[PDB]
Ligand binder design. Sequence first.
Ligand SMILES: Cc1ccc2occ(CC(=O)O)c2c1
Ligand SMILES: Cc1ccc2occ(CC(=O)O)c2c1
Lengths: 141, 141
Amino acid sequence: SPGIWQLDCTHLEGKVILVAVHVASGYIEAEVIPAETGQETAYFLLKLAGRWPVKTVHTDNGSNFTSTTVKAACEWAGIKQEFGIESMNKELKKIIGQVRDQAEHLKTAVQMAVFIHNKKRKGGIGGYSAGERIVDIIATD
Amino acid sequence: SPGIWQLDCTHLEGKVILVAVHVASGYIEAEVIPAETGQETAYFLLKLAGRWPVKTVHTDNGSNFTSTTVKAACEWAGIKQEFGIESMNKELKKIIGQVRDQAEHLKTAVQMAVFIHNKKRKGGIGGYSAGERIVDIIATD
Ligand SMILES: Cc1ccc2occ(CC(=O)O)c2c1
Ligand SMILES: Cc1ccc2occ(CC(=O)O)c2c1
């Protein structure tokens, strides 16, 4: 299971942020999209699956199950879409608050937040970042 | 040196594709941008540096040295910009030709091309993909 992810959205300044979490690591990827349309979700799944091993994507609701291009991205890349599973979305938003006045565009602040989340140590000291854990779980596999 | 990348652009259907190569692995990331502006290059560097260890980015010309937001992205993420160093751009374009009629948007075909490039074996058989090599070099570090 180095290939299990959770996909959810969150909202900030009235724009949509897609969030993929690697469950076993807490590594995250995220992007501001211009609406919820299946167009962009599909594109971000394909991007994510070109980068990392993506085998199963868990979602919490039915929106991803009613989109033709997500179905086609899933199929082209060999991703199982699968129903049933947060505050990862809440801690993301704290860091977006700590950095928001360091960049003009919200989407720059989302990427600064992802950077910090991925590279920091739990507690601030010792052990691995999310970034190290995802590589260590895939390497160890 | 798990953190050395090459950054270049290539062109197709009159749109710009940014290309980051992890030199020791051949792993690639790429994105269609709406012009060459330092805005998008900076954003893609920040994205790339949130995902992987990015310490030094080599470029071949002076365009990245004259952009304020690239300078600011470099500085915020701790990336050394460094002058002096392809046909990686040419093999990318072969695969974009093999897949172009499977997606409406060129940018979907660029991501299908990156997927294949990153996950395939050299020869088609045995050894590691680019995706496995980048994780193996970072893990082994
Ligand atoms: C098959 C596939 C996979 C991912 C995608 O992202 C966006 C699209 C739409 C398009 O350009 O054809 C798309 C298609
Ligand atoms: C400091 C920094 C780093 C990466 C970036 O990408 C785009 C911008 C512009 C902006 O929104 O402030 C930007 C800034």
